[PDB]
Ligand binder design. Structure first.
Ligand SMILES: CN[C@@H]1[C@@H](O)[C@@H](O[C@@H]2[C@@H](O)[C@H](O[C@H]3O[C@H]([C@@H](C)O)[C@@H](O)[C@H](O)[C@H]3N)[C@@H](N)C[C@H]2N)OC[C@]1(C)O
Ligand SMILES: CN[C@@H]1[C@@H](O)[C@@H](O[C@@H]2[C@@H](O)[C@H](O[C@H]3O[C@H]([C@@H](C)O)[C@@H](O)[C@H](O)[C@H]3N)[C@@H](N)C[C@H]2N)OC[C@]1(C)O
Ligand SMILES: [Zn+2]
Lengths: 119, 71, 86, 50
RNA sequence: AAACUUUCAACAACGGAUCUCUUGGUUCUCGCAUCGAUGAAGAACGCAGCGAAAUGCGAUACGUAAUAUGAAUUGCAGAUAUUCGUGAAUCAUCGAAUCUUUGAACGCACAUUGCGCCCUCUGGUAUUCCGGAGGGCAUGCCUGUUUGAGCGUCGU
RNA sequence: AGGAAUAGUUUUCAUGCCAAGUCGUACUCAUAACCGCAGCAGGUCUCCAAGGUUAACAGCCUCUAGUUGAUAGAAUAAUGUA
RNA sequence: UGCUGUAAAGCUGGGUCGAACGGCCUCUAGUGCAGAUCUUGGUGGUAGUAGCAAAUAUUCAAAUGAGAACUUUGAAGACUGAAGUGGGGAAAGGUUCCAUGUCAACAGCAGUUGGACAUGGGUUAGUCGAUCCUAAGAGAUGGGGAAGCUCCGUUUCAACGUGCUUGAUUUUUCAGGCCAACCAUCGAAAGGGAAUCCGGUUAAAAUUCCGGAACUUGGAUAUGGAUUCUUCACGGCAACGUAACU
RNA sequence: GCGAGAGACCGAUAGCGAACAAGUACAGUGAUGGAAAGAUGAAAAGAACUUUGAAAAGAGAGUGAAAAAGUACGUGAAAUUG
RNA sequence: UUGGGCCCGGCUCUUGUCUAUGUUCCUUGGAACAGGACGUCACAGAGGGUGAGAAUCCCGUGCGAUGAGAUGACCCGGGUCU
């Protein structure tokens, strides 16, 4: 089981990094006991606890940067949408919907009529 | 390795393959609060790195090894 | 002496390991891999050797990124997070 | 040779690691097929080609 | 006459045919359009309590988050793991991340784990010398900015 | 270019202080660890070099060091090989 | 075990065995083997046969062990004979190294032994190499070819420094003054090249560890000495000398 | 490439080279070349125990519907052999 | 003849939940999924699993019902302010 992710998200940057120090110290102690016991399933729990603390720190810091760049014209490229290389080269919705006034007048003057037959 | 702990005031560790002697000395100071006289390194035939860390005369390698927990 | 006696004088390697394909086909003096054509930009291949294309092609490795394009395409290339059901 | 590069020695360490017999507890698993390691290598029979 | 040889039968061998299947192959049809400098395909090396491979993954390493779901996993062991529950197992789902050394591969170099330079922080009595952490410095081309060059040239 | 007088140098004089990263390092190197399909009478670069005889680092005997490895036993016709 | 058919074949008794299969009317084909120096797999006679004969050569006893021509120890007899059958290395291999255990396969007899098999251990550097330099040569770059993959050019028809030193300023700004002929980069574990020795130590590492004694390079910087009123030292006829001595 | 449904197709020397840790093992300096190999049983119930032997094994016993199924494992032809 | 920005729908796409009827008796067998008897459901007697040929033991199949979330200048049914 180990540490719970929903409780980590209530903690601050200093609490998260100090809990990280405690977990690494506890993993190092287990590797010393590994030399003699020598089967410690507990190591698996502590390893995955570190991964969770490291995950929560990184996602906490990533939302600060996202809020920092919210609405900015230029944002870091790992915060941009990553669909495919070709989709990002595609014309935007505004660019693809651009129309000359000559074409706009023609479309307004002669719209596709709605009609039926036999009456 | 334990003979060297007893008989040479030297501690023997497995270390990251990417570390150099400066980083290993700093690491043992930060982790175990000891002064290394020198660090001798070695890449073992299984691809892992071994460090021979002789402490200064101000420390006792046997006592540090006891406190760490493997003797 | 062109057989067994001459075969005893083989101790200088013509090829060594290639950084690109890892194959021991990197010719030492020409500095070129006879297998993948490193350090040319394009990978070496020929239509007269189809079986060589089988040995090293898309899908013979991990496909660590293309593995998930089809699943991402199905979901419309979503951005955001899943929303908990209340 | 004694004078060897890092890349060569790295390749040699991996070859030693893979030159081990099957762990015995493998053969006890449900629907297990492997009974021995079919990829053993001896230094004088088959060469590493590095 | 025995032994020996030869023929047949019985049983036992040798060997893997036959028969019976089949998470494979092969061919046809139907539907869909989605790789990459936002670093692909491929390569190397690692990662598990006990693993060589295959499978998966990247120092957060047989995986982290999230959503769903609802009691396993299992060869053995084991909890400071769980059961009317924020909860066992789950590449079930998947939109958030991690993603070593490389590779079109981009500081230079590469049969080397070789060699610089710049910025911020930091250790050693330090703008220089030595160490550590983080972030950078490829080429071709386009638009723009700034700094310029030429009796090419206008005017004062 | 910079240096004098009640004063500037120079670590090319002595002594004193601090630091020196990365990778390799076992073993074989051959009548069995390399290449010849193999523990193959083949092939594969080089350093060290004792006493006697002698022109001689040749051949023959010996010291240090190293081996005593090459299926074995009993016989001894023909024909072989040396 | 028999029966039917001229025949291709069909049916049946007994034994073995364990999951599907057949008759009739039609359809369809990757439809019938003795051969192809046929293909793949398997197996004979030959035959317990040819053979296991180069490199002088072995023997007694003890130990171990179920078992000893072949292991270990002791005692002998021999040989290599320093141009070695000795002691090291380069290339190549890659754990073969060492200890412990072990003998199914392998060591063309054997095996208690092994470079075999199994489990562990083992390779420590400022001074030894690499790393750096350039050699024959290889090769980017403004470029000139080529449809192009690419070719050619490197003393390269080019506006080619990611310059250097000061008086300092910290204002992380300045200011000057020197210059730019040459120099992308790769290319040697035998060429060139900063600096380490002795003694001891392990089952297995050592110019690397321990003990002692040194050296080189880079940096910092204090003290003493030297120098200066003839400001940047004296002496020797001289060759030249010195602790220094812009 | 991705997702599906089918066949008067092949049935382990066939069908893709690969039904299996298959582009694997292995070969070549290299470009490349490239195999073999599916099936105990419903369930390991994979034979406790006694005995002979240095051991491998054997003989009893046991499990199982079957050991004429013993991880040399469905059936088990022929060549060849006792 | 009249433009555009917005709200709910429809359609289109992804996706959650839900469903009939024997395991009745006899015989064989290690095992009933075999045979026999009596049945049942069937818009479901496709396919698979389970100790042998299983519509009725399990999953499914067939029939529908009911939610959620996306996406569409470039599909339309309506509102709406200009
Ligand atoms: C007619 N146009 C010519 C143009 O062809 C060119 O002339 C080159 C000249 O530059 C070359 O000469 C040049 O290049 C050589 C190089 C090739 O080795 C150099 O050695 C030499 O110093 C240099 N001047 C000459 N060798 C040939 C002319 N056609 O440049 C000069 C020019 C007038 O523009
Ligand atoms: C024990 N040896 C292993 C083993 O796995 C072996 O298996 C065969 C197995 O394939 C045979 O079984 C066979 O069954 C049929 C039929 C002809 O028997 C074959 O067509 C099929 O290929 C195969 N599965 C089996 N009868 C004997 C085992 N030793 O196959 C490989 C091997 C290395 O020889
Ligand atoms: Zn290559």
């Amino acid at each position: 089981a180990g540490v719970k992710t929903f409780e980590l998200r209530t903690k601050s940057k200093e609490q998260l990094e100090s809990q990280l120090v405690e977990l690494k110290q506890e993993l190092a102690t287990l590797k010393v006991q590994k030399l003699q016991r020598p089967s410690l399933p507990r190591i698996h729990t502590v390893r995955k606890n570190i991964a969770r603390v490291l995950t929560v720190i990184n996602l906490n810091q990533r939302e600060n940067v996202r809020a920092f760049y919210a609405g900015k014209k230029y944002i870091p490229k790992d915060l941009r949408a990553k669909k495919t290389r070709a989709l990002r080269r595609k014309l935007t919705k505004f660019e693809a919907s651009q129309e000359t006034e000559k074409a706009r007048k023609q479309r307004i003057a002669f719209p596709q009529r709605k009609f039926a037959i036999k009456a | 390795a334990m003979k060297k702990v007893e008989d040479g005031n030297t501690l023997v560790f497995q270390v990251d393959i990417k570390s150099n002697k400066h980083q290993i000395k700093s690491a043992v100071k930060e982790l175990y609060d000891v002064d290394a006289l020198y660090v001798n390194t070695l890449i073992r035939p299984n691809g892992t790195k071994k460090a021979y860390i002789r402490l200064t005369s101000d420390y006792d390698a046997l006592d540090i090894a006891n406190r760490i927990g493997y003797i | 002496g062109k057989g067994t006696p001459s075969l005893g004088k083989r101790h200088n390697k013509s090829h060594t390991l290639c950084n690109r394909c890892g194959r021991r086909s990197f010719h030492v003096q020409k500095k070129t891999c006879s297998s993948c054509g490193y350090p040319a930009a394009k990978m070496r291949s020929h239509n007269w050797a189809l079986k060589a294309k089988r040995r090293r092609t898309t899908g013979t490795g991990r496909m660590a990124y293309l593995k998930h394009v089809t699943r991402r395409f199905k979901n419309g290339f979503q951005t955001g997070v899943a929303k908990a059901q209340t | 040779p004694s004078q060897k590069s890092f890349r060569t020695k790295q390749k040699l360490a991996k070859a030693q690691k893979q030159n081990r017999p099957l762990p015995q507890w493998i053969r006890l698993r449900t629907d297990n097929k492997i009974r021995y390691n079919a990829k053993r290598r001896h230094w004088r029979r088959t060469k590493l080609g590095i």
